[PDB]
Amino acid sequence: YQQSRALKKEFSLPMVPGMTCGEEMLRRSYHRTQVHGRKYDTNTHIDGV
Amino acid sequence: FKQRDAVIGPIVNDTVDPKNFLRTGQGIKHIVPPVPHKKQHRKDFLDCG
Amino acid sequence: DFQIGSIFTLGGPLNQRDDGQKRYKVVHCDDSQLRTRTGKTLAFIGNNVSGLLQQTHRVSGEAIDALKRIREAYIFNVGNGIPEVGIKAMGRHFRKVGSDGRRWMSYEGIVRFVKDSRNFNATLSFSDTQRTEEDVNTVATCIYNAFPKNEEECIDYDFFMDYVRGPMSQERKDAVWNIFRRMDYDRDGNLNIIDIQACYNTQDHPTCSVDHLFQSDKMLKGFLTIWDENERCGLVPYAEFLDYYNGVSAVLEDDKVFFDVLNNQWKLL
Amino acid sequence: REIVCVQAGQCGNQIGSKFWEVISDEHGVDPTGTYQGDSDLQLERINVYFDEATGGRYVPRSVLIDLEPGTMDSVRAGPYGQIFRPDNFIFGQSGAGNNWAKGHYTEGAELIDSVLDVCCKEAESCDCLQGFQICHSLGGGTGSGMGTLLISKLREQYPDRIMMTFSIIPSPKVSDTVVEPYNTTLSVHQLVENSDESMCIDNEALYDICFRTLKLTTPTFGDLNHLVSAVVSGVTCCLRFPGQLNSDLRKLAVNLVPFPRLHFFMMGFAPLTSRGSQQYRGLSVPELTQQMFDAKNMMQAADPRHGRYLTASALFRGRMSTKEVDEQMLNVQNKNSSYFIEWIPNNIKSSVCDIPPKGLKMAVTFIGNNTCIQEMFRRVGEQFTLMFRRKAFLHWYTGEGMDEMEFTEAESNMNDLVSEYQQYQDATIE
Amino acid sequence: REIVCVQAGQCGNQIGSKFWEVISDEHGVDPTGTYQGDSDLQLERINVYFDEATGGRYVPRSVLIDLEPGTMDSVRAGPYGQIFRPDNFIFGQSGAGNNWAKGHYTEGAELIDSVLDVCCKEAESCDCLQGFQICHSLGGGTGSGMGTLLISKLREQYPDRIMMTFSIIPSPKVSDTVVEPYNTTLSVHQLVENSDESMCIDNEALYDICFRTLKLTTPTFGDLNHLVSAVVSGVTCCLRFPGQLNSDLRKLAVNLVPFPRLHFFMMGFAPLTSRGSQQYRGLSVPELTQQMFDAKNMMQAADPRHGRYLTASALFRGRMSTKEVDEQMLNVQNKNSSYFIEWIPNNIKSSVCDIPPKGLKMAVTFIGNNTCIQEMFRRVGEQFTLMFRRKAFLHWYTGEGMDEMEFTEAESNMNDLVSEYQQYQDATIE
Amino acid sequence: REAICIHIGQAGCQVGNACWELFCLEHGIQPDGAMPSDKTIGVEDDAFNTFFSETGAGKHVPRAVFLDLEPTVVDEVRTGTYRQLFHPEQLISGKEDAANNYARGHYTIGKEIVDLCLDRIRKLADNCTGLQGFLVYHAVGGGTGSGLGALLLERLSVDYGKKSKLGYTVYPSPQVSTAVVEPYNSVLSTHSLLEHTDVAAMLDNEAIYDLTRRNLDIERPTYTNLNRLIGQVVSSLTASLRFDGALNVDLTEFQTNLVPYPRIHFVLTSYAPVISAEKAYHEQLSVSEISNAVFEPASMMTKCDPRHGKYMACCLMYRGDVVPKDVNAAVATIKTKRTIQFVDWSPTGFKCGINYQPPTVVPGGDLAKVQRAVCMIANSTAIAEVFARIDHKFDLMYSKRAFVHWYVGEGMEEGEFSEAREDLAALEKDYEEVGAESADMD
Amino acid sequence: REPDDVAGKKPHCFEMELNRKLVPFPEDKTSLPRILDYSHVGLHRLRDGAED
Numbered sequence A: 001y002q003q004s005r006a007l008k009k010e011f012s013l014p015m016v017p018g019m020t021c022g023e024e025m026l027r028r029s030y031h032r033t034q035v036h037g038r039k040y041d042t043n044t045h046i047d048g049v
Numbered sequence B: 001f002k003q004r005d006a007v008i009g010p011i012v013n014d015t016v017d018p019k020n021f022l023r024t025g026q027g028i029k030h031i032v033p034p035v036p037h038k039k040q041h042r043k044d045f046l047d048c049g
Numbered sequence C: 001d002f003q004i005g006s007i008f009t010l011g012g013p014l015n016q017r018d019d020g021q022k023r024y025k026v027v028h029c030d031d032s033q034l035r036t037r038t039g040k041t042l043a044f045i046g047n048n049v050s051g052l053l054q055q056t057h058r059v060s061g062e063a064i065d066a067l068k069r070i071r072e073a074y075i076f077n078v079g080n081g082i083p084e085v086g087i088k089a090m091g092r093h094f095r096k097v098g099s100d101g102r103r104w105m106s107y108e109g110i111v112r113f114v115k116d117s118r119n120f121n122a123t124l125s126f127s128d129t130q131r132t133e134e135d136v137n138t139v140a141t142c143i144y145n146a147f148p149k150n151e152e153e154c155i156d157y158d159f160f161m162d163y164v165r166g167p168m169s170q171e172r173k174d175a176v177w178n179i180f181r182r183m184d185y186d187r188d189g190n191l192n193i194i195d196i197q198a199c200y201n202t203q204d205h206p207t208c209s210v211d212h213l214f215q216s217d218k219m220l221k222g223f224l225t226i227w228d229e230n231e232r233c234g235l236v237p238y239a240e241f242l243d244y245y246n247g248v249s250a251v252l253e254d255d256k257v258f259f260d261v262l263n264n265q266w267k268l269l
Numbered sequence D, E: 001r002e003i004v005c006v007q008a009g010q011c012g013n014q015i016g017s018k019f020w021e022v023i024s025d026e027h028g029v030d031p032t033g034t035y036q037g038d039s040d041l042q043l044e045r046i047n048v049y050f051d052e053a054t055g056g057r058y059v060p061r062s063v064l065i066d067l068e069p070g071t072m073d074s075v076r077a078g079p080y081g082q083i084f085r086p087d088n089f090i091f092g093q094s095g096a097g098n099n100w101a102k103g104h105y106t107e108g109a110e111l112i113d114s115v116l117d118v119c120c121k122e123a124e125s126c127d128c129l130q131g132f133q134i135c136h137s138l139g140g141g142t143g144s145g146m147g148t149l150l151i152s153k154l155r156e157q158y159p160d161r162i163m164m165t166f167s168i169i170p171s172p173k174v175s176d177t178v179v180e181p182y183n184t185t186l187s188v189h190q191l192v193e194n195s196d197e198s199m200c201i202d203n204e205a206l207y208d209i210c211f212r213t214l215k216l217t218t219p220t221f222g223d224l225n226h227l228v229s230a231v232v233s234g235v236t237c238c239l240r241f242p243g244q245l246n247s248d249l250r251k252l253a254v255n256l257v258p259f260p261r262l263h264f265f266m267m268g269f270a271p272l273t274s275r276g277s278q279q280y281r282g283l284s285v286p287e288l289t290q291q292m293f294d295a296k297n298m299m300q301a302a303d304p305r306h307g308r309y310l311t312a313s314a315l316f317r318g319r320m321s322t323k324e325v326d327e328q329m330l331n332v333q334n335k336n337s338s339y340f341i342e343w344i345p346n347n348i349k350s351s352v353c354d355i356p357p358k359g360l361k362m363a364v365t366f367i368g369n370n371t372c373i374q375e376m377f378r379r380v381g382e383q384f385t386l387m388f389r390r391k392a393f394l395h396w397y398t399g400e401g402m403d404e405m406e407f408t409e410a411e412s413n414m415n416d417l418v419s420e421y422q423q424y425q426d427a428t429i430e
Numbered sequence F: 001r002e003a004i005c006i007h008i009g010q011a012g013c014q015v016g017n018a019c020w021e022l023f024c025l026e027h028g029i030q031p032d033g034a035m036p037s038d039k040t041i042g043v044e045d046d047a048f049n050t051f052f053s054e055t056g057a058g059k060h061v062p063r064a065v066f067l068d069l070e071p072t073v074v075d076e077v078r079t080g081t082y083r084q085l086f087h088p089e090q091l092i093s094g095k096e097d098a099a100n101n102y103a104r105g106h107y108t109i110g111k112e113i114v115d116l117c118l119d120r121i122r123k124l125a126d127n128c129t130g131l132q133g134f135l136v137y138h139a140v141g142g143g144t145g146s147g148l149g150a151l152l153l154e155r156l157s158v159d160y161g162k163k164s165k166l167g168y169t170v171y172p173s174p175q176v177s178t179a180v181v182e183p184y185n186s187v188l189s190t191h192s193l194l195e196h197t198d199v200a201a202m203l204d205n206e207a208i209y210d211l212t213r214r215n216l217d218i219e220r221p222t223y224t225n226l227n228r229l230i231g232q233v234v235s236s237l238t239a240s241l242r243f244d245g246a247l248n249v250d251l252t253e254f255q256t257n258l259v260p261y262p263r264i265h266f267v268l269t270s271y272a273p274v275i276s277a278e279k280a281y282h283e284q285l286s287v288s289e290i291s292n293a294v295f296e297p298a299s300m301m302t303k304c305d306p307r308h309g310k311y312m313a314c315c316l317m318y319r320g321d322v323v324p325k326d327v328n329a330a331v332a333t334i335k336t337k338r339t340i341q342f343v344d345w346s347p348t349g350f351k352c353g354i355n356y357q358p359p360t361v362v363p364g365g366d367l368a369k370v371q372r373a374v375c376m377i378a379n380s381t382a383i384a385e386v387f388a389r390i391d392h393k394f395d396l397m398y399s400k401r402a403f404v405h406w407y408v409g410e411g412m413e414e415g416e417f418s419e420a421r422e423d424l425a426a427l428e429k430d431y432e433e434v435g436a437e438s439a440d441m442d
Numbered sequence G: 001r002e003p004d005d006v007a008g009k010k011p012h013c014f015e016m017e018l019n020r021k022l023v024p025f026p027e028d029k030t031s032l033p034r035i036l037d038y039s040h041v042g043l044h045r046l047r048d049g050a051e052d
C-alpha cells in the first residue's frame, strides 16, 4: 500500500481577524513592474501545452 | 421568472457642468403613488343589552 | 483502463473533501465520440496494485484453522447458535474507518479480538491464567503474521473477511447498498433505530404466522437488541449494517435464496 | 440577491484587495479561481459575490477605478491579483493631485462613461440586484471626486436599490493631507443627499485598537485593512448563510435610520483578543457584548458618553441560544437607560447566523447610530471656516472652475446637519 | 440558390482573396480544388458558391476586375490563387488614378463589355440565380467608378434579383486619399438609386475593434479582411445549412427596409474577445446580445446613442433554444425603448442556424438600420461643399469631361437623404 | 511614470553626474548601458522606465539633456566614464560662456542656443506616454544658469502649459561668495522665477559645508560630496514613483499641498540620517530620532533659521522600514513643541509619504548605510530674510550704478533693475501680510 | 543584490491540530425506540360507512 505519483496538497491556516505579523516587511527589494499602461495581455498566466 | 437584460449605456459627459452644482433638497426620491383599498366592516357592534 | 469494473487510484486529495488516498471504480462508460482506441495487451487494467498483491499472496493453513476455530467460538458463545449475530459481533473492535477508506487491524486489536471468543480460559488460578495468556498470544501472533502489513503495522479487514466470510459477488453488495440507501432519509452514514423497528418484517414470518412458535413483537424486540448502540443514542453506522449482512451472506450459499430472503426481510416501499 | 463592489483610489483599491482575500478564504476559492472548499454551505451562495466563468472558475463582482495605475499594478502583482477580470480595471493618464475639483470635473468627466459601462454590465448580470458597496477615502482626490460622481450617476440609474459606502475620515490629531477640510466638506455635502447609509472610520482609532487591544509589535496597513475587511464581510454574513433570525441590508437601514438625513453610523467588531491573554477569558455572549459596547473597540474618535443612542444593531455568528441574546440586550438597555433616547421603546435589533468565521467559535459586528457624530462635523466646519475666510488654497479650486457659492452651500448643509442632531439630542416628550 | 461574387479594385480583390480562403476552409476544399471534408453537411450545399469541374474539382463563381494587374498578380501568386478560373481575370493596361471620371467613363466603358459578357455567362450557368454580391471601396478610383457602372448594367439586365454591396468608406479622422469626398459623393448618389442593400465599414472602426476588443499587438490587413470575411460568410450561413428558422437575403431586405431609400446598415460580429480575457467570460446568448448592442463592436464611427433603430436583424448559428433568443430580443427592446422607433411594435428579426463556424461554440452576425448614419453623410457633404466652393482639384474631373451639374445633384441628393433621416428620427404619431 | 531632467551650466551638470551615477547603481544598469548577463532572476523588470528607455537591443539610455555655453565641462562628460551611456545629441555645448552676465545669457547667446535645447526636449517628450513633470537643476549666481534657465523655463511654460516644473536652485550663500555681481544675477533670475516655476527648492553651499563638517567627519570637503547629498535628496523625492509603498506621493501633490498663494512657492529642504560609519555604530536610528533630527536647524541645506518665522505646510517623505503608527506618534510629538509655530489659517499642516525601498549605498560614498531615512520640504515665512539680504547688497551697489554698463551693453534697459527690485520689495510685503493672524484683524 | 527572507521555519509543535474546515463537526442527533402499548393501533378511528 504505497502512495501513487500525485502528491499531497497542503492548505494554509485560517485568517483570524487578529494575530497577524508584518510578513510584507521581510522582502528586501520592492521594484514595481508597469503592467497596465504597457502590457496589452497583462500578467495573465496560461499553462504550457 | 425574469432572465437577464442587455444594456446600451447612457452618455452623461455633457450633463456635468461646473455652473450647475448640487443644492439642498434636489436629490432623487422614489415615492410610489397612493393606492386606495376598500375595507369591509361586516363586524356587528357589541350589543350586551 | 476505463472499462466497467476497473478500479484505479491517482494520488493524494487535491481538495478538502477527502483526507487520504482513495480508490475509484468505473460504473458507466460512453464512447459515442471515441475514434482512437488504445490498449496494451497482457497488461493489468487500471491502477489496482493492492488487488494484485492480494491475489498473489498466499496464507498458511494453520492460520485458516485458527480462524475456523475462532469463528466457531463466536458463533456458539457470543451468539446463541445463530451464525449471523455471531459473525456480526466478530468485527466489533474494527468499526473505525480510516482516511484511506478501509478498516485496519492492529495487533493489540487482534489480541483483544481472540480473547473475546470465550474459548481460551480455565480456572482462575495463577498458573492457568498464565497458560491462557501464552496460548492466546501464540494464536494472535500466528494470525497476525499471515497477512500483509502497511505502514504502522496494520492489516486489512476486507482481506480478513475474505477468509472468514468468503468471496462475495458484486450483485450482493449492490443490493445491500440499495437497501441502505432506501432506508436512509438523510444523507449521513447513520440509520435510526425507529426506522429499523418500523421497516422490519416480523409479522409475516412463518414462525409467527403459520407455526405460532414465536411471537411477533417479542422477536421484533430481540431483533432490536442485537444492534450495539440501540439503548443509548439509536444510531447504526454503515459498517455495522455491512457486518450484519456479511454474516448473512456467509450463512447462505445460493444466490436466489439470498435475494429472496433479502427482499422479504424489509418491507420498504 | 447580489452585491456589486466599487474600489476607488489608493485606499479603496488596497482595502478591496484585502477584502477579496478574506472573502476568497471564507468560501475556499483558490487564487487560480478553482473551488477547493469542503462544504456545500460554501457553494450554495457563492453567486452573491462571484460570477461563474467556464470550467469551474469564479470572478469577483468588482470595479477598480484610479487615475494612475500604480496601485492597480501593485494589486495585480499581489498573491490573489490574478482573480480580477482584466477589463474591470479603468485608468487615466494623470493623477488627481489630492484636488476635489480636478478629480470631479477634469479627469472625472473624461473617464466616467467607461466606469458606467462596466458598472451597468455588472449590475445587469445579477439575478436580483441588491445594493451597491463603495470603498473610498473622503480626504483624497480621486476617492472623493470619482466616488461622489459615480454615486450620483448610479443613484440616477438605480434609484430603488441601496447605496452603501465605507469611508475614511481625517483624524482629529494629525492630518495626512493639508487641504483635507475642503474635500471632506464637499464630499459630506454630496453624501447626505445621495447616500442611504454611510460608515466612517478614523485611522487613529485603528492604530489605538492595534496597540492597546492587540498589542502588535510592528503593525502594518495590511492589519488595519484586515480589520476593516473583517467587519465589511461580517455585515453581509446573514445575506449568504442560514440562521435562526435572518437579516438583510434593507432591514438594517429600516431599523437604523429614524429620519432620512440621520444616516451616519459608527462601526465595531468584537472578538479582538490580545496576543498573549486568550487563556484569561472564555468565549461567551456576555464577553462579546462587553467588548461590543466598549468605546475602545469603536472605529471612530467620537465617544458615546457625550451623546445618546437613537438605534443600534448587532449581528451574531455562531451556535448560541436566542434567550442569551435577548436578555443581554434587555440588561444593557435597562442598566444604562440614560444613554438611550427615551421616546423610542427599544433601540437595539438583534440577528443570529449559524456559521461563524473560520477559526472563531463566535463573532458579532456592531453598527451604532449616535448623536456624538455631530462633534466631528463641527470640527470640520471650524477648520473649513478658518481656511475659507483667508482664501488659504482656494485659487486651485477656483482656477479649475468651481463657483465659490458651492462652498457656502456645503458649509450651510453641514451646519444644518449638526443643528438637526443637536435638536434631536435635547428633544423631550412633554 | 446561387450567389455570384464581384471583386473590384485593390480593396475588393484583397478582401475577396481572404473571403474565398474562409469559405474554402468552411467547406473543406483543398487549394487544388479537391474535397477533403469530414461531414456530408459540407457537400450538400457546395453548389451555392462552387461549380463542379471534372473528376472532383470545384471552381468558385467569382469575377475579378481591375485596371492594373498588380493586385491580381499578387493574389494569383498566393496559396489559394490556383482555384480561380483563368478566364475570369479581366484587366487593362493603365490605372484609374483615383479619379471617378476616368474609372467610370474612359477605361470603364472600354472594359465593361468583357465583364458583362463574363457575368452573363456566370448568371446563365446557374440553375436558379440568387442576387449578386459585390465588394469594393468607395474612396478609390476603379472600385467606385467601374463598380457603380457595373451595378447600373446588372440592374438593367437583372432587375428582379437582389443587389447587395459591402463597401469601405472614408474615416472621419484621417484620409487615405485627398480627393475622397468627390468619389464618395458620386458613388453614394449612384448607390442610393441603384442598390437594394448596402453595408458600410470604416477601416478606423476595424482598428478600434482590434485595439480595444482584441488587443492585438501587431495587426495586419489580413486580420481586418478576416473580420470582414467572417461577417460576410456569416450573413449567408442560413442560405447554405439547415436550421430551425430559415432566412434569406430577400427576407432580410423585406424585414429591414421600411422605405426604399433607407437601405444603409451598420454591421457587427459578437464573439470577439482577447486571448487574455477569454478565461474570464463564458460564451452565452446574453453575452452575444450584450456584445451585439455595444457600440464598441460596431464597424462604423457613428454611434447608435445619437440615433434610433428603425429595424435590426440577428442571425444566430448553432443548436440552441428559441426561448433564449426571443426573450433576449424582447428584453433589449423593452429596457432601452428610447433608442427604438416607437411606431414599430417590434424592431428585431431573429434567425437560427444549426451549424456554427468551426472552433466557436456559438456566433451571431448583426445588421442594424439606424438613423445615426445621417451624421456621416452630413460630414461628407460638408467636406464636398468646402472643396467645391473653391473648385478644389476640379480640373482633373472636368478635363476627363464631367459636367458640374452631376456634382450639384449628388450634393443635393445626399443633403435630402440627411434631411429625410432627420425627419423620421423626430417623427411622432400625433 | 516618466520624468525628464534638464541640467544647466556647471553646477547643474556636475550635480547631474552624481545623480545619474546613483540612478544607474540603484537600478543596476552598467556604465555601457547593458544589464548584467550573469544574473538568472528570470523576471524582466521595468522600474527603470521612469528614468531610462530601451532601444530593443537591450541598451539603456537616459531621459536627460546637458546644456552649457562653455565646452569644457560637457567635453569632460563626453570623455569621462559614462561616455557610452548618453546619446551624443543630449550633450549640447556652445563656444563661449555668459561671463557671469545674466543679460548675455538671456538676450544675446542663450537666445541663439535655446531652440536646439527646445528641439531636444521635444524629442524626449515625444517618447513618453505618462510624462508628469520636468526636473531642473541650475544656479542663479552665474550668468548662463540664470539667463538661459529663466528663458528656457519661460518657453517650456508657454509650450507645455499645465505640466509641472520643479526647480532645484543654488542661491548665493550669505558669506561664502564666488563672484562680485551675484546679487544682480540672482535678483533678475528671481523676477522671472516667480512667474514661471511651480515649486523652487533653495540650496546654499555654506549650509552643506557646515552639515558635512558637523555630522560627517570630513575636514576638507569638496563639491563632489555636496553633489552626492543632492543626488540622495532627488532619489528620495522620486522614489515614490519607482517602488512599492504604503503612501505614494505623485509630483503633482507637492504643488497642491505646499503652495497657498501663487507667489508663495519657495520651500526649504532638509535630510535626516547624515551620519558617519563610526558614529553609526554608537547609536540606534529609530523613526522618532530621525523625525526629531529633520527639525533641527543644523540639518537644513539652506542658511535660514525657521524659528524666525511660521510654517504654512510641511511634506514629510519616509523611505525604508517604517510603520505608519510611528510616523503618527512622531509628528504629534513634533506638533507639541513650543519653538514650532503654524499660521492660524493653516490648521492641517502636514502631508506624509511612506515608501519601502531603503536608500542605496555608493561604493566611494561618505554616508553610512542605514535601514531608513526621512526627507522634508516645508514652506515658512523665515524665507523673507534671505531676499532682504540680497536686496541690501543690490541697493548698496545700484546706488552708484556700479556695474550696470556691462548689462546695458549686452542688451538690457536700465529700467529692468528698478522693476525687479520693486517686485522683490512687494514679495517681502507679501511675506509680512500672509503671516498676520486672523484673530488680530477681527 | 541581497536575497529575500521568509518565515515558514520552526513553527509550533502542534500546528497539525489546527483545523482548516468551515464545519469540522457534524450535527449531533439521537433516536428513541417506541413502546408498543395497545394505544399503538387501538383507539384509531374507522371510515364513516365500514360494513361487516
Ligand SMILES: Nc1nc2c(ncn2[C@@H]2O[C@H](COP(=O)(O)OP(=O)(O)OP(=O)(O)O)[C@@H](O)[C@H]2O)c(=O)[nH]1
Residues within 6 Å of the ligand: F008, F009, F010, F011, F012, F014, F015, F069, F070, F097, F098, F099, F100, F101, F139, F141, F142, F143, F144, F145, F146, F170, F172, F177, F178, F205, F223, F226, F227
Ligand atoms: N553645490 C555646488 N555648487 C556649485 C557647483 N559648481 C558651482 N557651484 C556654485 O554656483 C555658483 C557658480 O555658478 P556657475 O554654475 O559656475 O555659473 P554658470 O552656470 O557656469 O554661469 P557662467 O559662469 O556664465 O557659465 C557659485 O556660487 C559656486 O559656488 C557644484 O558643483 N556644486
Ligand SMILES: Nc1nc2c(ncn2[C@@H]2O[C@H](COP(=O)(O)OP(=O)(O)O)[C@@H](O)[C@H]2O)c(=O)[nH]1
Residues within 6 Å of the ligand: D008, D009, D010, D011, D012, D014, D015, D096, D098, D137, D139, D140, D141, D142, D143, D144, D168, D170, D176, D177, D203, D221, D224, D225, F246, F247
Ligand atoms: N486604512 C487605510 N487608509 C489609507 C490607506 N491608504 C491611504 N489611506 C489614507 O487615506 C488618505 C489618503 O487618501 P488617498 O487614498 O491617497 O486619496 P487618493 O489620492 O485620491 O487616492 C490618508 O488619510 C491615508 O492615511 C490604506 O491602505 N488603508
Ligand SMILES: Nc1nc2c(ncn2[C@@H]2O[C@H](COP(=O)(O)OP(=O)(O)O)[C@@H](O)[C@H]2O)c(=O)[nH]1
Residues within 6 Å of the ligand: E008, E009, E010, E011, E012, E014, E015, E096, E098, E137, E139, E140, E141, E142, E143, E144, E168, E176, E177, E203, E221, E224, E225
Ligand atoms: N479594409 C481594407 N481596406 C483597404 C484594403 N486595401 C485598400 N483599402 C482601402 O481602400 C482605399 C483605397 O482604395 P483602392 O482599393 O486603392 O481604390 P482603387 O485604386 O480604385 O483600387 C483606402 O481607404 C484604403 O485604406 C484592404 O485590404 N482592407
Ligand SMILES: [Mg+2]
Residues within 6 Å of the ligand: F009, F010, F070, F097, F142, F144
Ligand atoms: Mg560657467
